[PDB]
RNA sequence: UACGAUGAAGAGUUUGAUCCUGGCUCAGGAUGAACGCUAGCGGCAGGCUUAACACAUGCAAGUCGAGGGGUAG
């Protein structure tokens, strides 16, 4: 899209030990989405916080992905692991709300979902839970897509 | 592009820094509740969870003369 809004999930300070002393450094994770159909996460590493966030959003502006969000939310229930984390997304209604964790909430608000229930029965690492949410969101295929893949009309997949 | 289902949130903490497993704690609801501070009412509900420990005193199961002898009065 064109009206991309960013959201900083977490900023973590790292350190590399050298002969002299401690070499600090800032890492930031930023998810930027059009709030309607497309979203993308990025990682930025620098020495200043503003520079790290700028590098993160500049890297996240690339490799955007399209996600089906039938009606107002996910079409079906889906699991996504990506190693440590384990996210489970379920559609609820058209007025429920986004019941998500700490880092899943930002992704689900940037992709454009407004009523979903997500349970993170796993780790609490912002680096891995965002990618787990992405893996659980990219495996979703809508009714038209499954009907076209099967070859059957869009009435037998319902009846 | 319908059907039913009105329903599921995390965070801190081991390390110079990272990921994982893993334990502790917190954010919510509730009570025959107690304690501290405070204090204007109305409706309704509740009130010895412990010693089935020991009890002063009052009341808590009587009625029928259309069953009977019927007495004081």
Describe the structure in your own words.
Strand 5 (78-80) and strand 6 form a beta hairpin. The chain has 4 helices and 8 strands. Helix content is 26%, strand content 32%. The protein has helices spanning 49-60, 103-111, 126-138, 143-150; strands spanning 5-17, 22-33, 38-46, 65-66, 78-80, 87-91, 98-99, 116-120. The two termini are 36 Å apart. It has a 4-stranded antiparallel beta sheet. A 4-stranded mixed beta sheet has the order 5-6-8-7. The protein binds one RNA strand of 73 nucleotides through strand 1, strand 7, strand 8 and helix 4. It holds the Pfam family Ribosomal_S5. It comes from Flavobacterium johnsoniae (Cytophaga johnsonae).
Write the layout of secondary structure elements.
Layout: E1 5-17, E2 22-33, E3 38-46, H1 49-60, E4 65-66, E5 78-80, E6 87-91, E7 98-99, H2 103-111, E8 116-120, H3 126-138, H4 143-150
Parallel strand pairs: 7-8
Antiparallel strand pairs: 1-2, 2-3, 3-4, 5-6, 6-8
The chain binds one RNA strand of 73 nucleotides through strand 1, strand 7, strand 8 and helix 4.
Order of adjacent strands in the largest pleated sheet = 1-2-3-4
For the sheet with most strands, the description reads: 4 strands, antiparallel
The backbone outline, from C-alpha atoms, is: elongated
The percent of residues in helical segments reads 25-40%
What fraction of residues sit in β-strands?
25-35%
Spell out the helices and strands N to C: EEEHEEEEHEHH
Rounded radius of gyration (Å): 18 Å
Calculate the terminal CA-CA distance, rounded to whole Å.
Answer: 36 Å
Main structural class: alpha+beta
Subunit structure: Part of the 30S ribosomal subunit. Contacts proteins S4 and S8.
Family: Belongs to the universal ribosomal protein uS5 family.
Function: Located at the back of the 30S subunit body where it stabilizes the conformation of the head with respect to the body. With S4 and S12 plays an important role in translational accuracy.
Keywords: Ribonucleoprotein, Ribosomal protein, RNA-binding, rRNA-binding
């Amino acid at each position: 899209g064109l009206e991309l809004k960013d959201r900083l999930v977490s900023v973590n300070r790292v350190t590399k030990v050298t002969k002299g002393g401690r070499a600090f450094g800032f890492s930031a994770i930023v998810v930027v989405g059009d709030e309607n159909g497309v979203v993308g996460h990025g990682l930025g590493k620098s020495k200043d916080v503003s520079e790290a966030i700028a590098k993160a959003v500049e890297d996240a502006k690339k490799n955007l992905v399209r996600i089906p969000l039938n009606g107002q939310s996910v079409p079906h229930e889906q699991k996504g692991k990506f190693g440590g984390a384990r996210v489970f997304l379920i559609p609820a209604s058209h007025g429920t709300g986004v019941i998500a964790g700490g880092a899943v909430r930002s992704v689900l608000e940037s992709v454009g979902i407004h009523d979903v229930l997500s349970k993170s029965q796993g780790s609490s690492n912002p680096h891995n839970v965002v990618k787990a949410t992405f893996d659980a969101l990219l495996q979703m295929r809508s009714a038209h897509t499954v009907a076209k893949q099967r070859g059957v009309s869009l009435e037998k997949v319902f009846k």
